[PDB]
């Protein structure tokens, strides 16, 4: 909004932020406060990959999600089985955080040859991908849970990491577009 | 022609384990038994048949 270094530490900093969130969300098991069993059915807090007994009997049982059931399963439809995958792969929040660094990387590569300016550019389309990877993880997470419940801190951790992603990549932008206005201001002079 | 060429074997050991695999198959098998006693079992809990 205003400078150039500035603009450059709070795009670097709002980065490696969302990296973290993202990082901490998927690396987590806070996403899922509900009932259910951790080894009867008993308070416990699930993640993406594994499930955590809260104020059970056995309490620290991180056991991992049924993300395919035996005993019957009664089989799935071929968009039900591609989403049980996707959600017990997690392919897209891992994407999110590939594509989250993937944006970290060119940033700081962004120091070093300063004359190609289309790397800003390609630092802004990963952190809006990134943000887009999030968002559809968060879908297909939820959609898959709904299949009492509460939503634990690393869900919020994701939506604020997805959050200042898009904010980076706006701010990324930003930064394109005002080292191309600056190319045209001195190549018209 | 469909029960005699069908894998796995559709036919079952006793009525009572017909009846428990029609809970376990969620709506993909049918049992094919007397109207009575079926009728008896449609009124008895958990009334999911």
Redesign the interface.
């Given at each position: 909004l205003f400078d150039r270094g500035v603009q450059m530490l709070l795009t670097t900093v709002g980065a490696f932020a969302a990296f973290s969130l993202m990082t901490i969300a998927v690396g987590t098991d806070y996403w899922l406060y509900s009932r259910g069993v951790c080894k009867e059915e008993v308070m416990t807090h699930s993640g993406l990959w594994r499930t955590c007994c809260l104020e059970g009997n056995f309490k620290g049982l991180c056991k991992q999600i049924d993300h395919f059931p035996e005993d019957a399963d009664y089989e799935a439809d071929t968009a039900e089985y591609f989403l049980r995958a996707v959600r017990a792969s997690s392919i897209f929040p891992i994407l999110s955080v590939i594509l989250l660094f993937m944006g970290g990387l060119c940033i700081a590569a962004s120091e070093f040859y300063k004359t190609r300016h289309n790397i800003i550019l390609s630092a802004g389309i990963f952190f809006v991908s990134a943000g887009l990877s999030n968002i559809i993880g968060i879908i297909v997470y939820i959609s898959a849970n709904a299949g009492s419940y509460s939503y634990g801190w690393s869900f919020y951790f994701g939506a604020l990491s997805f959050i200042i992603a898009e904010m980076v990549g706006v701010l990324a932008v930003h930064m394109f577009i005002d080292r191309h206005k600056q190319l045209r201001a001195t190549a018209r002079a | 022609t469909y029960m005699r060429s069908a894998e796995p074997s559709v036919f079952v050991r006793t009525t009572a384990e017909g009846v428990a695999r029609v809970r376990?198959?969620?709506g993909?098998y049918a049992y094919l038994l007397e109207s009575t006693m079926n009728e008896y079992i449609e009124q008895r809990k958990p009334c999911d048949t």
């Open positions: - | 376990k198959s969620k993909k």
